[PDB]
Design an enzyme around this catalytic site. Structure first.
Site: not given
Ligand SMILES: Nc1ncnc2c1ncn2[C@@H]1O[C@H](COP(=O)(O)OP(=O)(O)OP(=O)(O)O)[C@@H](O)[C@H]1O
Ligand SMILES: Nc1ncnc2c1ncn2[C@@H]1O[C@H](COP(=O)(O)OP(=O)(O)OP(=O)(O)O)[C@@H](O)[C@H]1O
Ligand SMILES: [Mg+2]
Ligand SMILES: [Mg+2]
Lengths: 147, 53, 242, 241, 249, 231, 147, 245, 211
Positions: H32-33
């Protein structure tokens, strides 16, 4: 020989043809074929048996220090040298250095002289130039933990 | 039949490489999907080890 | 020092009393511009310039492949001064083998000739050979040999200075708003080679196809340096030189 | 098939596993040059900082291990902090059980043994770093000791590290031949920083700005690192040379 | 963790122990070292070697004192010697200097370091040490004695021997020059002469580390006035002193 | 290929494969469906016999006086982790006089499965639990993945044909959250959820095992003729 | 060498220094080394054009030095120092040095002074072989005449 | 060359590299960012938390865990593995807090985790971690921000990023530091963390996401790590919409 | 080419970003060849497509054939290797010589592990038949040959095994990675094959994508 390709079959024919007529060349006023190879583990032993090639010359890539100083000395007499340079500082550095590499080293020192705009080869040039064309560290390089 | 020969998984080894085995294997692969549709050709593989593949 | 000078004046080499050099081997990690370096010097020096891929002189036919190579020097001598340029001499300058096949043993027949053509009893006048290679390590020991080839130029990866120069050579040409981001970029772009730099200009330019800008932003330069960096590292690193 | 996959011997008598560490050291591209002054030791090193987004104060390869012992690290930065932690720790322990601050000589041999054990295990990876320990000792004066992943070490008149260090070794060797005195002499430490910086500018064929240098000097009874502000006052001092 | 509890020295199938065989290759890669046993001393000798001249030789050591009566000199790997010298001093105190109050005889100490050898030719997660040591010494009942401790873990008593890369040529020179009376001063002339033919690099009193186990010097004792104890028998020769005997060839 | 033998070896796809393999133990497993409202949680499990002479294997293990778990993987693996949850639920009542939070109990569970998958000579635990409970912030439904990963959902499934069950829950999503206080209706909404994961096996008074927990109902397992009103 | 800043401007800056040349002359009387500093500080500029411009001034002080009979030594040492640093270019200096040699001729100094002075000048161009070579033979024939 | 060199990690490959650990950077690449903006007065973490199904409970899952009362730790990659690395530093931090009775410095804490990930690469028997963390907080020496690579490497940072959208993030954080190279406000930086999560959502624009934001700031929170919630969180959300319009 | 079946970009379902990255490097320098000349940058010399097998790198090329309507030189890398000495090399030069004529061009190479890698140096054998035909490939990508009217599209499912000289931006400029379908993209795929056979609308595509 693979002995199924034509490239190889043609060399088979040559190799028997040279060898046969080398025996034909026997009892003549001629001294038989001199031939050289920088390799020697690649040659067929059929040449290397007595009655064809007889004299086997060895050439080392080792030189002792009296014999080394002489090679640097003849090449350096052909070039010009400063009265401020010496050749006995050059031979202690290496323990192993073949006769042609000495030639090229001597070249380097005199090539470097064109850059500096020097007639002579001052020992300074000579030393720097010496270290160029040495190389070959792979067991002393970072591998001094075998001594 | 029996493509334990000509089916070795590709690896780099510095001796010579697996070049002769894989040359044949990769020819095969490209003609089992084409860059064009292949004709009516059903292909049966039969193996003792699907792990050398 | 090797290519321009004895053409112009061999009187310089005569002063010292030493032979002029012939035979240059260029070696480097890929994209360092070793092919580029020779292409540039071929239009400058103004002698005849033979351009020769080392892998298009090998035929099927049996020793035609060697017939070409002898001619190549015999042409050279006759147009002297001349320059023979061989690209990628891993091809026919390979290791010795003699446990190969028929194909590899063929290579021995062409190599053995080319070695004798360079030095034999036949001398070369002003015929000069620049060979280029991607590794000096897998070339034959007899070729590599000191005195066979003379000057051994290392082409390094561009130094802390060099990086700035290269970036400027590819960016003057482009349209741009005015780019002052090279001060950041050279710093970012460590571990690159000359070819990847030339690609960052192209890459910055592809962000501007999307922006529909007809000028390359200095912002677009920061992105480019990153886009190149990531992919490069991942897929394989580059060669080391002895 | 398994002789170059744990640190056992090969048919040659070599340990390739130990050897690969020496091929990991020079992949960071960080150079170091270290000379022993008259009463100081000066070590200068690059500080490559790739991206804009790194905070530059934190990027370092000069680690304070004692008051008298600094340690300069070439090779990957994970292996650097684990060799650095083990060093500080051993320095504390020595103080504890023997009642004087640790002399460098002894830290050199102490991290060497730990290196040696790491190549006689089968579950320990030899740390791939070359550490150079610079000091000023009150019995043996300014010294340089360089340890390496195998567990060999030797003292030095000067030493360099990195992948361009073949070049640096050449400059320093000429320097000590011509002069004929084993250590560089100059009384003030500030000016050994100047001589040292010139020799890195000549050897690498590159100029250096303040953020590219990070300089450590061990003088008497203290190790400090120069702030990048203070390193510029030295860069100016090369402009009047 | 540790799960390496299996030996990595294993029997090879046509016989022999493969790791110990290999490790003896690694012995013959390194420097050349020799020892000559006289009737009143033992001399030991080695050549220094550096990466560059920038290394100091002054802080380097290759001949070490294990006890004042027993020295050691190696040929093989630098790292392995370094730890094994320290383990030798340790067992020599812990197992004869706390138990019988004094330094151990040369036969006994040799026997302990062969057992240090042995427990890295065996046990898990370990390979053999890659040195062969001469451990020369003097005890009061077996005289002057020279030993060779090896990667196998055997010991052999010797009267003169050599180890290292020039071992083959060295010992033939030494077989023909040995005699059944030597003085320690006469011993030296043999050892230097031999070590000169195995060096081809520079030769100096700073690059040949030479040690005698002569006879007692009360100037290294550190004190005077207990006549019961008699100073270091071990005495490493300074660069100045070695240089005279070099000219004496 | 050779990457699949142990729990230590990455893996060129960013994975480790063995944990991937243990996740297929859940797939070959039988279905259990969880759904929750804002006041009662329901586990609706379908029990599985081997043969006709065989019994049915308990799929819902009451873990505490306000917690119940249901297995969908290895039966031996489920026995290890269930003890560990009881242990930490009882250590909380003894030391801090606190009913063990549902949100906290997924984190305790978490780390017991991670530490054997990071370790050599261990393995991952190939069982996924659906853990219901009613604590101080209400009803909770946890899905424990054999990956170690915990997620908190309003209704989920695991098993075989389980996807068909997530869909029944996905449609009926905005309905069931709003019915509160009426456990009859949630139960029925969960029976119909697990019935779209059938393929000629049906549901009876020896297949269906329901357990609920409420605000106003402590943990109750209904079986026998007590799941005969709720087909 | 070359720079993109001191082309036209600095040539005009050497023309400002020439209006300040009489101040330099008057300063040379009190200590020669003080006067000498300003002309050396000008020759720290890289550019062929400005290099030629600057050095005229240095040769113009080298008449002052040559005029005096105990200051003739100073110019010999300076030219040693000029070869050794780098100069600032290796085109510039070799021409300017000839003008010094020219001055040696026409100065009509004591015979004692002339002998030493020509030896100090030749010592500099001993290893070299460019433009210098031609010059060297030109002052040595003149040195040989005195002897 | 020899075959091996990828079955363990206390092998080195013939080029001196790792494997597992080089393979471990690809485990972190699927994550995930997660970004961190270093403001003058503290840190702002923000993380894209995907709503991967409509059956997840919104605002009840978190990947931002607090360690002590003043160091936020935020990770991407293997999420269970990532909680274990935070868990180790809650034990380590707690030990420090008893022994010296001060909250563990950010440079001290950086040092403590760092060793831990490095230790797992020294054995053949423990699997190297496949997470990258961004952590920092406010201590007595000011604010600091660290990213710790899976390789057991960490450095100082002014902005750091991890996951899939690390390409867009790294590029978008260069811009924010060239807007304010003289520093920026911690109130403000909430809103910028929002803007650089929504631009980095374009590698991942297939799905829909919940933005979670947190801050540890000296002048609004008194140097204690708290979550950005309520009205302030909805302002940042509305900010991000208007920018991406 | 004899026209390879049109797939359009409705049968390259999903993977949008890859189609975008590919058409920029291959299709725009043909059509919009004028706009890069204006920008003063140079067009690519190639794209590389690498990923795990089965992700339609071969599909995307087949598409690209139908769309650009230029000469597309299909190539399979074991076809090129030839047992007569350097007639494998004759095949490189002719195919590329051909591409100068029929310009603008696209050469699509399938596989690249039959031009293998350069690492051999051991005395016993080697195979220096593979190396030579590979080093000939690089000399055509060099500056003396055309490269501004010849694009090379390269597709492989191993990228590690390759020698660095095929690699680097400027031989193969683009390094396009293909991942596996996303949750939503799996759904897209399934629905585009199902048009070819019968369906009923009970089938909920979503369930299948999840699975
Ligand atoms: N030294 C350099 N300075 C400037 N431009 C450079 C340099 N090196 C490479 N480039 C740029 O990158 C381009 C591509 O590099 P080029 O193909 O010439 O590389 P090479 O190192 O000779 O290749 P190969 O290893 O394939 O033989 C050049 O044409 C030029 O635009
Ligand atoms: N994203 C996709 N959309 C549509 N169909 C696809 C997609 N990916 C693959 N396919 C289908 O799967 C088939 C087989 O894959 P294909 O052989 O093209 O793959 P590749 O990854 O280029 O392989 P290799 O490297 O093994 O030759 C394609 O012919 C195509 O029909
Ligand atoms: Mg294929
Ligand atoms: Mg080329």
């Amino acid at each position: 020989f693979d002995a199924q390709t034509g490239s190889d079959r043609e060399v088979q024919r040559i190799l028997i043809e040279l060898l046969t007529q080398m025996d034909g060349f026997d009892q003549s006023t001629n001294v038989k074929v001199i031939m050289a190879t920088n390799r020697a583990d690649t040659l067929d032993p059929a040449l290397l048996r007595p009655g064809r090639l007889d004299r086997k010359i060895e050439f080392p890539s080792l030189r002792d220090r009296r014999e080394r100083r002489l090679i640097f000395g003849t090449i350096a007499s052909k070039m010009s040298l400063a009265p401020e340079a010496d050749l006995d500082s050059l031979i202690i550095r290496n323990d192993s250095l073949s006769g042609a590499v000495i030639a090229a080293i001597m070249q380097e020192a005199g090539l470097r002289a064109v850059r500096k705009n020097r007639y002579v080869i001052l020992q300074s040039d000579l030393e720097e130039a010496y270290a160029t064309q040495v190389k070959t560290d792979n067991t002393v390089d970072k591998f001094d933990f075998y001594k | 039949d029996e493509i334990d020969a000509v089916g070795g998984a590709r690896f780099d080894d510095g001796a010579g490489g697996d070049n002769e085995v894989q040359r044949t294997m990769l020819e095969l692969i490209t003609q089992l999907d084409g860059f064009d549709p292949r004709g009516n050709i059903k292909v049966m593989f039969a193996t003792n080890r699907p792990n050398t593949l | 020092e090797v290519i321009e000078l004895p053409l112009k004046n061999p009187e310089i080499f005569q002063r010292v009393g030493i032979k002029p050099p012939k035979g240059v081997l260029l070696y480097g990690p890929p994209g360092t511009g070793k092919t580029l370096l020779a292409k540039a010097v071929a239009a400058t020096i103004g002698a005849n310039f033979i351009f020769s891929p080392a892998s298009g002189i090998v035929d099927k036919y049996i020793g035609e492949s060697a017939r070409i190579i002898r001619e190549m020097f015999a042409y050279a001598k006759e147009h002297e001064p001349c320059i023979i340029f061989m690209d990628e001499v891993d091809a026919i300058g390979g290791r010795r083998f003699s446990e190969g096949t028929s194909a590899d043993r063929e290579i021995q027949r062409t190599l053995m000739e080319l070695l004798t053509q360079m030095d034999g009893f036949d001398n070369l006048g002003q015929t000069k050979i620049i060979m280029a290679t991607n590794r000096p390590d897998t070339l034959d020991p007899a070729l590599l040999r000191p005195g066979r080839l003379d000057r051994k130029v290392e082409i390094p990866l561009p130094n802390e200075a060099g990086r700035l120069e290269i970036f400027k050579i590819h960016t003057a040409k482009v349209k741009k708003t005015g780019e002052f981001d090279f001060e950041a970029a050279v710093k970012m772009s460590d571990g690159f080679n000359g070819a990847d730099i030339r690609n960052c200009a192209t890459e910055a330019g592809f962000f501007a196809i999307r922006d529909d800008r007809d000028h390359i932003n200095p912002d677009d330069l920061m992105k480019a340096v990153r886009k190149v960096a990531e992919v490069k590292k991942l897929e394989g690193t580059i060669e080391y030189q002895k | 098939g398994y002789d170059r996959h744990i640190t056992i011997f090969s048919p040659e008598g070599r340990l390739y596993q130990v050897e690969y560490a020496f091929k990991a050291t020079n992949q960071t591209n960080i150079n170091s040059l270290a000379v022993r002054g008259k009463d100081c030791t000066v070590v200068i090193s690059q500080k490559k900082v790739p991206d804009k987004l790194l905070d530059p104060t934190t990027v370092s390869y000069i680690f304070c291990i004692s008051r008298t012992i600094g340690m300069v690290v070439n090779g990957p930065i994970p292996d650097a902090r684990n060799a650095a932690l083990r060093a500080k720790a051993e320095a504390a322990e020595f103080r504890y059980k023997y009642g004087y601050d640790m002399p460098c000589d002894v830290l050199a041999k102490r991290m060497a043994n730990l290196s040696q054990i790491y190549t006689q295990r089968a579950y320990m990876r030899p740390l791939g770093v070359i550490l150079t320990f610079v000091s000023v000792d009150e019995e043996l004066g300014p010294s340089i000791y360089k340890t390496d992943p195998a567990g060999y070490y030797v003292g030095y008149k000067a030493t360099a590290t990195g992948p361009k260090q073949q070049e640096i070794t050449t400059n320093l060797e000429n320097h000590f031949k011509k002069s004929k005195i084993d250590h560089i002499n100059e009384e003030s430490w500030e000016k050994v920083v100047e001589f040292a910086i010139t020799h890195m500018i000549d050897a690498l064929g590159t100029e250096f700005s303040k953020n590219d240098l990070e300089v450590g000097v061990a003088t008497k009874d203290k190790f400090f690192t120069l702030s990048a502000e203070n390193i510029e006052e030295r860069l100016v001092a090369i402009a009047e040379q | 963790t540790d799960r390496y509890s299996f030996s990595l020295t294993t029997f090879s199938p046509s016989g022999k122990l493969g790791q110990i065989d290999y490790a003896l290759t690694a012995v013959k890669q390194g420097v050349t070292s020799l020892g000559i046993k006289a009737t009143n001393g033992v001399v030991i000798a080695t050549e220094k070697k550096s990466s560059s001249p920038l290394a100091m030789s002054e802080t380097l050591s290759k001949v070490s004192l294990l006890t004042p009566d027993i020295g050691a000199v190696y040929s093989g790997m630098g790292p392995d010697y370094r730890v094994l010298v320290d383990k030798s001093r340790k067992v020599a105190h812990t197992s004869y200097k706390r138990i019988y109050g004094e330094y151990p005889p040369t036969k006994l100490l040799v026997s302990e370091v062969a057992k240090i050898m042995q427990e890295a030719t065996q046990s898990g997660g370990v390979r053999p040490f890659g040195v062969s040591l001469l451990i020369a010494g003097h005890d009061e009942f077996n005289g002057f004695s020279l030993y060779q401790v090896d990667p196998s873990g055997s010991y052999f008593p010797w009267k003169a021997t050599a180890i290292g890369k020039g071992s083959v040529a060295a010992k033939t020179f030494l077989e023909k020059r040995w005699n059944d009376e030597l003085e320690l001063e006469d011993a030296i002339h043999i050892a230097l002469l031999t070590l000169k033919e195995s060096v081809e690099g520079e030769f100096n009193g700073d690059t040949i580390e030479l040690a005698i186990i002569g006879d007692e010097n009360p100037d290294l004792l550190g004190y005077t006035g207990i006549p019961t104890d008699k100073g270091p028998r071990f005495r490493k020769l300074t660069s100045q002193e070695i240089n005279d005997r070099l000219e004496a060839l | 290929n050779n990457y699949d033998g142990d729990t230590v070896t990455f893996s060129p796809t960013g994975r480790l494969f063995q944990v991937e393999y243990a996740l297929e133990a859940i797939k070959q497993g039988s279905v259990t469906v969880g759904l929750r409202s804002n006041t009662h949680a329901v586990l609706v499990a379908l029990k599985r016999n081997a043969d006709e002479l065989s019994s049915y294997q308990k799929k819902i293990i009451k873990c505490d006086e306000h917690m119940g778990l249901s297995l969908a993987g290895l039966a031996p693996d489920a026995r290890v982790l269930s003890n560990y949850l009881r242990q930490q639920c009882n250590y909380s009542s003894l030391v801090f006089n606190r009913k063990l939070a549902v949100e906290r109990a997924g984190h305790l569970l978490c780390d017991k499965a991670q530490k054997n998958t990071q370790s050599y000579g261990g393995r991952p635990y190939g069982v996924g639990l659906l853990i219901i409970g009613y604590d101080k912030s209400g009803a909770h439904l946890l899905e424990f993945q054999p990956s170690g990963n915990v997620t908190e959902l309003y209704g989920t499934a695991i098993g075989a044909r389980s996807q068909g069950a997530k869909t029944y829950l996905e449609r009926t999503l905005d309905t069931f959250i709003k019915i509160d206080g009426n456990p009859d209706e949630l139960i029925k909404a969960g029976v119909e959820a697990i019935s779209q994961s059938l393929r000629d096996e049906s549901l009876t008074v020896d297949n269906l095992s329901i357990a609920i927990v409420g605000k106003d109902t402590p943990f109750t397992i209904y079986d026998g003729e007590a799941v005969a009103k709720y087909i | 060498m070359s720079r993109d800043a001191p082309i036209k401007a600095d040539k005009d800056y050497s023309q400002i220094l020439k209006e300040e040349f009489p101040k330099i002359d008057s300063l040379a009387q009190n200590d020669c080394n003080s006067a000498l500093d300003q002309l050396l500080v000008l020759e720290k500029k890289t550019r062929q054009a400005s290099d030629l411009a600057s050095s005229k001034e240095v040769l113009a002080k080298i008449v002052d030095l040559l005029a005096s009979r105990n200051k003739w030594d100073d110019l010999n040492e300076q030219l040693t120092l000029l070869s050794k640093k780098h100069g600032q270019l290796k085109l510039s200096i070799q021409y300017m040095i000839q003008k010094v040699m020219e001055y040696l001729k026409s100065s009509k100094s004591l015979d004692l002074n002339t002998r030493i002075s020509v030896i100090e000048t030749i010592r500099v161009v001993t290893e070299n072989k460019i433009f210098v070579e031609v010059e060297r033979a030109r002052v040595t024939k003149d040195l040989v005449e005195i002897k | 060359i020899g075959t091996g060199y990828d079955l363990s990690n206390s092998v080195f490959s013939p080029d001196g590299r790792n494997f597992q650990v080089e393979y471990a950077v690809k485990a972190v690449e699927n994550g995930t960012t997660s970004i961190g903006i270093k403001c003058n007065d503290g840190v702002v973490f923000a993380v894209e938390k995907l709503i991967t199904s409509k059956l997840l409970v919104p605002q009840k899952n978190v990947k931002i865990q607090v360690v002590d009362r003043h160091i936020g730790c935020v990770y991407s990659g293997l999420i269970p593995d990532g909680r274990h690395l935070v868990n180790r530093g809650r034990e380590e931090a707690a030990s420090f807090k008893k022994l010296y009775k001060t909250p563990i410095p950010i440079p001290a804490f950086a040092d403590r985790l760092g060793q831990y990930v490095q230790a797992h690469t020294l054995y053949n028997s423990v699997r190297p971690f496949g997470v990258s963390t961004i952590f920092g907080g406010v201590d007595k020496n000011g604010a600091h921000l660290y990213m710790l690579e899976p390789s057991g490497s960490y450095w100082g940072y002014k902005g750091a990023a991890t996951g899939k959208g690390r390409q867009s993030a790294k590029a978008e954080l260069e811009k924010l530091v060239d807007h304010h190279p003289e520093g920026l406000s911690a109130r403000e930086a909430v809103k910028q963390a929002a803007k650089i999560i929504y631009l980095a959502h374009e590698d991942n624009k297939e799905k829909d996401f919940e933005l979670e934001i947190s801050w540890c700031s000296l002048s609004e929170t008194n140097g204690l790590h708290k979550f950005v919630k309520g009205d302030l969180l909805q302002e940042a959300i509305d900010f991000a919409q208007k920018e991406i319009n | 080419v004899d026209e390879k079946p049109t797939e359009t970009y409705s049968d390259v379902g999903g993977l949008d970003k890859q189609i975008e990255e590919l058409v920029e490097a291959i299709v725009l320098p043909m059509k919009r060849a004028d706009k890069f000349k204006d920008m003063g940058i140079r067009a690519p010399k190639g794209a590389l497509m690498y990923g795990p097998p089965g992700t339609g790198k071969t599909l995307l090329a087949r598409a690209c054939a139908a769309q650009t309507n230029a000469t597309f030189l299909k190539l399979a890398a074991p076809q090129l290797v030839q047992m007569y000495i350097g007639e494998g090399a004759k095949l490189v030069r002719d195919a590329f010589a051909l591409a100068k004529e029929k310009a603008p061009t696209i050469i699509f190479i399938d596989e690249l592990d039959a031009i293998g890698t350069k690492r051999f140096d051991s005395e016993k054998s080697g195979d220096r038949e593979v190396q030579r035909t590979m080093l000939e490939l690089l000399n055509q990508l060099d500056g003396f040959s055309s490269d501004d009217r010849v694009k090379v599209l390269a597709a492989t499912n191993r990228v590690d095994v390759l020698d660095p000289a095929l690699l680097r931006s400027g031989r193969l400029d683009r390094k396009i990675e293909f991942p596996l379908p996303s949750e939503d993209s799996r759904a897209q795929i399934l629905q585009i094959h199902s048009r070819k056979m019968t369906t009923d609308d009970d089938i909920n595509w979503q369930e299948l994508a999840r699975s």
